[PDB]
Amino acid sequence: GPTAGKIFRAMYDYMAADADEVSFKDGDAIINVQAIDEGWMYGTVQRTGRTGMLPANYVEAIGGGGITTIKEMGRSIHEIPR
């Protein structure tokens, strides 16, 4: 069945420093990530379709299960007698 996943999103603007890097803007989806290693990742900026190397410290991961709140309405603790 479907599972909780995680995606990657740029946090800051970046201009590529070489032909193997890609430029992106704050908020860009970074998709089909092939690897993350030592401050660099290889991925596709979805808005432009360009694929290459990105500085990993410019992108954040979003997703997973989060923290789910469950409500319990029963008595929580012992009652001290009167």
Binding site: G65, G66, I67, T68, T69, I70, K71, E72, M73, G74, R75, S76, I77, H78, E79, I80, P81, R82
Partner: protein
């Protein structure tokens, strides 16, 4: 083996926990357990827990964080304070219920003003004009 029946971060929020705690604090007060202060109001004495008093009253918060009164297990209120009004407010602190028998609203409101319990004073203002 049999089925494990185990579900392969959660926050469980106990919606009546705070009211269960407050009830038990009032049960402790009724049995005089861990009470650490007596409030003296004219000829009348009321034993209580400092932490509950300071949670509810600006006046008691100032008293029990005043370094000069750190050692005091007896607190004398101003002689103008009505002990019946004080008892009503003390019961409110420990129960969430403010008892307004006929004719008592001004004494309760005045006691709440002295104790610097402004949300109770505001509720009394709404009550008295309705």
């Amino acid at each position: 083996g049999p089925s494990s029946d185990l579900y392969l971060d959660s926050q469980i929020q106990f919606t009546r926990h705070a009211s269960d705690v407050l009830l038990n604090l009032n049960r402790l007060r009724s049995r005089d357990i861990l009470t650490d202060v007596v409030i003296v109001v004219s000829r009348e004495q009321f034993r209580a827990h400092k932490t509950v008093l300071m949670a509810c009253s600006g006046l008691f918060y100032s008293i029990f964080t005043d370094q000069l009164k750190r050692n005091l297990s007896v607190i004398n209120l101003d002689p103008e304070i009505n002990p019946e009004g004080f008892n009503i407010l003390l019961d409110f602190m420990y129960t969430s219920r403010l008892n307004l028998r006929e004719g008592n609203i001004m004494a309760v409101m005045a006691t709440a003003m002295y104790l610097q319990m402004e949300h109770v004073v505001d509720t009394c203002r709404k009550f008295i004009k309705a």
